[PDB]
Amino acid sequence: LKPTTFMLKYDENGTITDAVDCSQNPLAELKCSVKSFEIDKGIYQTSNF
Amino acid sequence: TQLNRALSGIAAEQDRNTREVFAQVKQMYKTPTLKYFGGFNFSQILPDP
Ligand SMILES: *[C@@H]1O[C@H](CO)[C@@H](O[C@@H]2O[C@H](CO)[C@@H](O[C@@H]3O[C@H](CO)[C@@H](O)[C@H](O[C@H]4O[C@H](CO)[C@@H](O)[C@H](O)[C@@H]4O)[C@@H]3O)[C@H](O)[C@H]2NC(C)=O)[C@H](O)[C@H]1NC(C)=O
Ligand SMILES: *[C@@H]1O[C@H](CO)[C@@H](O[C@@H]2O[C@H](CO)[C@@H](O)[C@H](O)[C@H]2NC(C)=O)[C@H](O)[C@H]1NC(C)=O
């Protein structure tokens, strides 16, 4: 197990349907950035280095 | 991160102002080789090639 960051998706019944590692790859921080699985075309400011 | 949006909200909207003023043309037009029209002299207004 590692102490890292997850985004969780719950249904209307309270059941986990989906999740995304917020430390996996640079796309996946962006889904954690805007709080959306679906993301429009554009340029998006994410976290510093 | 709230401070990052507030500057990036400005920095894009500051970039939007420059497009609306200048680029009101669809078409780039070449500078004519005649910088002298009917007695009027446009040399200090057009760029020199
Ligand atoms: C519209 O007005 C503009 C003024 O903004 C004018 O542009 C400039 O005019 C002068 C004079 O006609 C040009 O200067 C010439 O450039 C050549 C380049 O080698 C010089 O050698 C010339 O100098 C000789 O002649 C002078 C007097 O005749 C002497 O003082 C000198 O020692 C030399 O003997 C001459 O000065 C200048 O080049 C233009 N500017 C540009 C960017 O071209 C323009 O001519 C006017 N429009 C028209 C259609 O005339
Ligand atoms: C969430 O739970 C509800 C029950 O409250 C499920 O709704 C039922 O689903 C069955 C089969 O799909 C239907 O026959 C019933 O008519 C539904 N009942 C109601 C009240 O809607 C629902 O399917 C669950 N959500 C998911 C994604 O399965």
Question: A35: which residues sit within 8 A by CB, 6+ positions away?
Answer: A7
At B45 the three-state DSSP class reads coil
Radius of gyration of chain B (CA): 19
Determine phi and psi for B34, rounding to 5 degrees: -100, 105
Dihedral angle sign, alpha carbons of residues A47, B4, B5, B9: negative
Report d(CA A20, CA A4) in Å as an integer: 11
B16: left (phi over 0), alpha (psi -120 to 50) or beta: alpha
Q: Do B8 and A45 touch (CB under 8 A)?
A: yes
* Ligand 2 pocket mutation pick from A13, A15, A16, A18 by most atoms within 8 angstroms of CB: A13
Long-range contacts of the stretch B38-43 (C-beta < 8 A, 24+):
none
Determined by: cryo-EM
Closest Cα of chain B to A17: distance in Å? 28
